[model samples]
Target chain A: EIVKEYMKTQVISVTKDAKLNDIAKVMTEKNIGSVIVVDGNKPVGIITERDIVKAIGKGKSLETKAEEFMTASLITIREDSPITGALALMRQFNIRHLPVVDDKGNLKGIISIRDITRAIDDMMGE
Target chain B: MEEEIVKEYMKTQVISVTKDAKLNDIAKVMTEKNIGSVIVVDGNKPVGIITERDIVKAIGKGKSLETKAEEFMTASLITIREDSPITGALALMRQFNIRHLPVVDDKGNLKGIISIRDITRAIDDMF
Candidate 1:
C-alpha cells in the first residue's frame, strides 16, 4: 500500500534557480507534464502544464526563473504512505502532484493523480 | 430518485479536430480555444482524443507541425453514457487515469465530450 511501489522514481526535475525557458526546454524535449523543482536535494515546488499555461497567459517570458511559476506550497507525503493517502493529499490540497519524502523530510520520489489512477487500474485490470 | 445527471453538467460545445490535423495546428487550437483536449473524429464517429500533453509529447518526439493527429491520438478511450451520473464519470476518470471522455447515447452516438476541467467549470457555472 506504500507509495514507493506506485511512485515514479525516474522523475524529471529542475532547479528553482533554473530559467523558465530552460524548464520549457526540459518539458518540450522530455515530453513531461510536470517537473519537480528542487532546492539542493529538497523538493521545494512543482511546475505543471497549468502553471506553464498560466505563465503563457500572463505573457511572461521564457527567461523567467522557475521559482516564479512553480507552485511553492508543495505538500509532500510519506514515502511509505498508502496509495489512498496520496489521493487524499491531492484532493485536500487541490493538487495533482506531490513530492514523496522520507520520515526525515528528504525527497526520495514523486507521485501524481495519473500515477495513482494507473496503479488503481493495474490493481483492477482496467 | 435524484434528477441531476451528466447532461446537466456536460458542455454542449464539442470543439474537435480532424485526424489529419497537424500537431502545431492542434496546439494552436488548444491555445486559441483555451481547451485542454480536443476530440478527433472521423465523420460521425469519435476516433480519438488529443490533449495538450499529447501535443507536447509530439514535439518532444522530434516530430514537426506536419505530423498527423491520428499518428498520436489516443484511441483506447474510457467512455461513459450520457445518462450516467456525473460522479460515475468522475470515478471512472480517477480510476482509469484519463481526463477526456466521449459521452455517447444509447445508439452509440457521440453526444459530446467531458473532462475534469469541464466538470469544475460546470460547478463554477452553477455557483
Candidate 2:
C-alpha cells in the first residue's frame, strides 16, 4: 500500500501564529487528533491532541500560540512511500499522524495510523 | 486482517486506574507510558476510558489535579469482542476519533486492549 492510496487529501491546517484554543476547537470540530501547521506554502510543524494536553497541564492559557506547543521537528514522507515505510517512521518517532510532502517540500496530504490500519485491513481482504 | 483476530493484535498488558483516581494520577501513567489513554477499571473489568482529549477537556473546563478520573472518563465505553474483525475495530476507532479501545470477551470480561499504535505495529510485523 502506498501513501497516495490512503492519505487524506482534504487537510485542515493552521498557521504558526494560531492560538491553541482555535487549534483545539478545530480538532474537536473536525473530530481529528492533529493539524498541520504551515508557514506560507510549506508545512513546518504540527499541533496534536497530545501536545494540547501537555500544554494545558503546564497551565498554558488557551491564548498560547500554536508555535509555542507545535512540534517543529517534523518527520515527513513522500506521497508514493510504502505503507510499511510510513509505519516504520511512525514507530521510530512514536507518532500517530505524519505530514505527507511532495518532492519540492509542499504539503501533499496527511496519513495517519488509522489510515494504515484501513490499508492493512484492505490488503488482508477484510 | 481477515486471517488475524483482535486477540492477535491486542496488547494484553494494560495500565489502569481506579475510578477515584485523581486526574494527574492518570496523566502520570499516560506520560510514563507515552500513551494517549488509561483504562479505568474495577479489578479486571474495564468501567471507563480517560483519553488525552478528556484530560484536555477537563483542564479547559477548569478541572484541577484534585478532580477524580470518573468525573471525566467516558463511562459509556464502546468495547469490542476479542474475536471481532480488525476492519470493524479500526473503523470504529476512526468513526469515534478514538485511539484506545478495551477488548473484552463474550462474557464482558476484559481480556486486553488495542490502540491505533498497536494496530500499526501489527501491520509492520506483517511486512
Which candidate leads in DockQ?
Answer: 2
Error of 2 at B77 (Å): 8.3
Q: Give lDDT tens digits, candidate 1, residues B1-127.
A: 4634577767677878888987656766776778787888776467888876665555445565578989988775467788987777888889988876888777666788777886777556666
**What is the TM-score of each predicted model, taking all chains together?**
0.54, 0.57
Expressed as tens digits, the lDDT of each residue in B48-80 for candidate 2 is 988899877665566666789789998956788
Model 1: per-residue Cα lDDT over A59-95, one tens digit each: 5554668888788855789879999999998999888
Error of 2 at A54 (Å): 3.7
Q: For residue B71, what is the lDDT in candidate 2?
A: 93
Looking at model 1, what is the TM-score of chain A? Answer: 0.80
The whole-model C-alpha lDDT of candidate 2 against the native structure comes to 0.80
i-RMS, every candidate? 4.4, 3.4
Best by TM-score: 2
- The list of candidate 1 runs beyond 4 A from truth reads A103-106, A117-126, B1-12, B16-34, B39-50, B54-127
**Clash list (residue pairs), candidate 1:** none
